[PDB]
Design a binder for these strands. Structure first.
Length: 256
DNA sequence: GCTACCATCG
DNA sequence: CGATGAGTAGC
């Protein structure tokens, strides 16, 4: 079985302090995509780059303690791509791609827009620039999984408070419609939603109020999968036995 | 301190 | 509903 895990660690050093390093191994995952390193290459221990002897490739932000993504894998990728190809976004380390034969896995951290209008601007530009990348990827004819924090919930079932967030970044009409475009127009599969029609599967909870304990959550972490591979997915779960981050790791198993 | 990332209340 | 009011990681 091919087990792929996507986890926004909200700072990899912190997450390692909260037992994520042991989780990497215990999970028995073949590939682990992570977002929000909140660290630069110089700030990472070897175990944060090649955990348990896994291969690892990362893209770090230019500003310190900020963003960054990585892909860890037991198997050696025969090819690796660092960044999307657009300076504006690559400055923040939000895209890594690893190839393994006909399979490719991407670790993606899509910009949040809840901080300032400018950031929502950046996010929209990101959507514009990324859509065609997804189109081309879809057009390669290979098995591609885009793991990561898309920072966008699709439908009402994807977050507890859906009515009151229709005006907040993450659930704006244009965002939802963009995700819908990625799915129904481009043909990508939202693996969780397809595997489990009625299961909300929240993957994030705000630090405000008692959101976590109350399970007032959002499903903004995805594995977006190409058709042939999507058809092979057998199960998935959101790991909550331990809390490494404000996000929970999303685990999918594929009968490859 | 600073920066960057919507649940709850009236 | 609009108005109000935050906890966290890393600097």
């Amino acid at each position: 079985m091919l087990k792929i895990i996507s986890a926004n660690v909200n700072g990899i050093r912190s997450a390692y302090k909260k037992g994520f390093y042991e989780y990497i191994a215990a999970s028995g995952a073949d590939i682990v995509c992570v977002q929000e390193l909140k660290a630069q290459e110089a700030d990472l221990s070897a175990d944060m780059k090649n955990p348990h002897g896994m291969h690892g490739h990362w893209h770090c932000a230019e500003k310190r303690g900020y963003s960054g993504v990585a892909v860890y894998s037991k198997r050696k990728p025969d090819n690796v791509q660092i960044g999307m190809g657009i300076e504006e976004f690559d400055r923040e380390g939000r895209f890594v791609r690893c190839d393994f034969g006909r399979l490719s896995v991407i670790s993606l951290y899509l910009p949040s827009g809840s901080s300032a209008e400018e950031r929502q601007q950046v996010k929209y530009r990101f959507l514009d620039a990324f859509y065609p990348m997804l189109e081309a990827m879809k057009n390669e004819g290979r098995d591609i999984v885009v793991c990561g924090d898309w920072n966008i919930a699709h439908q009402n079932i994807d977050l507890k408070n859906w009515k009151g967030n229709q005006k907040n970044s993450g659930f704006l009409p244009e965002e939802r419609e963009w995700i819908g475009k990625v799915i129904h127009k481009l043909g990508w599969t939202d693996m969780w939603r397809t595997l489990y029609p009625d299961v909300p599967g929240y993957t994030w909870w705000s630090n405000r109020g008692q959101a976590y304990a109350k399970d007032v959550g959002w499903r903004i972490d995805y594995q977006m999968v190409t058709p042939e591979l999507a058809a092979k997915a057998v199960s998935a779960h959101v790991y909550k036995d331990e809390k490494f981050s404000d996000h929970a790791p999303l685990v999918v198993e594929y009968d490859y």
